[PDB]
């Protein structure tokens, strides 16, 4: 009742050298497990868009002689830079769940966390406010949506029962 997956699914089907953690991690887990280098990537992209606009003005100015771009452009540059940096950090961190990059730092955290959720006496991936049909369709929508980050942003917010794992 509300956690039997009722489908057949990959078991530990790793996408690289390294073992998988989730087949689609929840958004909270991706934000929880990202490294300080990932926050450095977010800061890099937040800095690189207004500095890039200042740079591209210094190369070729718009109306002939060089001025700084307006603050109305710098703030939109910084907002879109945070958007690029968050997309980059979410994709970087999701790669560690799939097992295509190095994830021995996070594999320990997940075995600790699922041992804790066994000790707390609750479900291994979360109680959801959905029928299992809707959980299944909702996770068919967000399965492997990190590919195609170039077109559209799409995330996992459903606590559905299957993540390409056993027991």
């Amino acid at each position: 009742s509300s956690s039997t997956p009722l489908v057949k699914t990959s078991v530990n089907y790793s996408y690289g050298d390294y073992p998988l953690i989730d087949a689609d991690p929840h958004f909270k887990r991706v934000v929880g497990y990202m490294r300080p280098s990932d926050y450095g990537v977010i800061g890099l992209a937040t800095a690189a868009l207004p500095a890039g606009i200042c740079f591209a003005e210094w190369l070729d100015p718009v109306k002939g002689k060089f001025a700084r771009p307006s603050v109305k452009f710098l703030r939109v540059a910084t907002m879109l830079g945070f958007a690029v940096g968050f997309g980059a950090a979410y994709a970087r961190s999701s790669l560690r769940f799939f097992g295509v990059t190095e994830n021995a730092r996070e594999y320990k955290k997940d075995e600790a966390q699922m041992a804790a959720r066994k000790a707390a006496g609750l479900e291994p991936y979360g109680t959801s406010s959905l029928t299992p049909e809707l959980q299944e369709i909702a996770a068919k929508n967000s399965a492997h949506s990190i590919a195609g980050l170039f077109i559209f942003p799409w995330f996992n917010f459903v606590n559905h029962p299957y993540h390409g794992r056993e027991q």
């Binding site: 809707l134 369709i137 909702a138 068919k140 929508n141 559209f152």
Partner: protein
Amino acid sequence: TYYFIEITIFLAILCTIFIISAKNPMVSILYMIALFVIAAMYLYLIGLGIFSLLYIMIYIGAIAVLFLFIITLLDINSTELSVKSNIRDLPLVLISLIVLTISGLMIYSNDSILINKLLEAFGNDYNTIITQDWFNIENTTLLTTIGNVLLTNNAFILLVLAIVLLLGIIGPISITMKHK
């Protein structure tokens, strides 16, 4: 009241011929509105009562209104169906009518054989047997299931469709404004 579908088929033929040969451009457009009504008649006739009112609401009430609204305040020249103009067209009209008609009838068939492909389109005569099964417990009609599958299984199609509606807003504005 057996031949209803045949009657709508014939009346649709006649209405298209009145569309393509009409004095006045908006006499032609009112014949198109009549063809939409014949369509909605066929759709209620086949069993789709929802769609017929969707056709009357969207096609008649928005697209035909936009079309008539265009014809009113714009100037459009028109020649009428002279016989000097258009019987130079008629031999290829006849060849393409028979060929395109038979060819549209062709692809509902699976034979190696050419005219066994054709005459299986006319093998229509057998009356489908409708059985009652009591397996469905609720009033899920057709609009409900369209709302389930536009929203769960094809939610991405609905959001790309939102981008298409956005483009239908932005584009006509972007053309016709002359910014300051």
